[PDB]
Ligand binder design. Sequence first.
Ligand SMILES: [Ca+2]
Length: 223
Amino acid sequence: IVGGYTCGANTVPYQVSLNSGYHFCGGSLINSQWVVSAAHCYKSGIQVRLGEDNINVVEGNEQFISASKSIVHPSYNSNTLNNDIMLIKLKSAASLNSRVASISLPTSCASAGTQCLISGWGNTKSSGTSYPDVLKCLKAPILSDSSCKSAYPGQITSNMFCAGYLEGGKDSCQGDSGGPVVCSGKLQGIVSWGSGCAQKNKPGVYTKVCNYVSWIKQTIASN
Ligand SMILES: [Ca+2]
């Protein structure tokens, strides 16, 4: 997250870190057994880390739980990032508590202009590289579809939305991928892509989770 703030330990209690020997992507806990992330974060051998603040220090509230299954969307296209969503099942149910909690899925899609909370352990620099140890947060508005299409002509599908600041300076970034965009208490986006980070006229692009609620529900009903 570039231009964000330190969230505060365990105040984003649905935020997970996906670990394959190191943090490589975020995700969102949607119930005791399941995490939503980005399909472009797929790796074999994922350990889900819940209750994290500093990902390099054991602080006492973590639950580390292996993935048993990952399910990339049937229509994910890695070339265009359309349908950039993945489900990850945990080998055992998380113990839900004040610091490890699920985030609601949406019923309706989010409104343009809504200020959402984006979080992660990704790069904090627009030019160069610095990865934080503690979880970072950013408040960012959903941009209009017209504005998003203008920014990335030919590349925005109905399953994507843009959010952030066209003047630059505030965005998600590498390593935030797969983590949450929460709007009105619902998981409405997944950190997906963007040209660079926090560059002028190049806002973040996010998977539009409200297009996936029927696939998420039938998949979890079946696995
Ligand atoms: Ca930790």
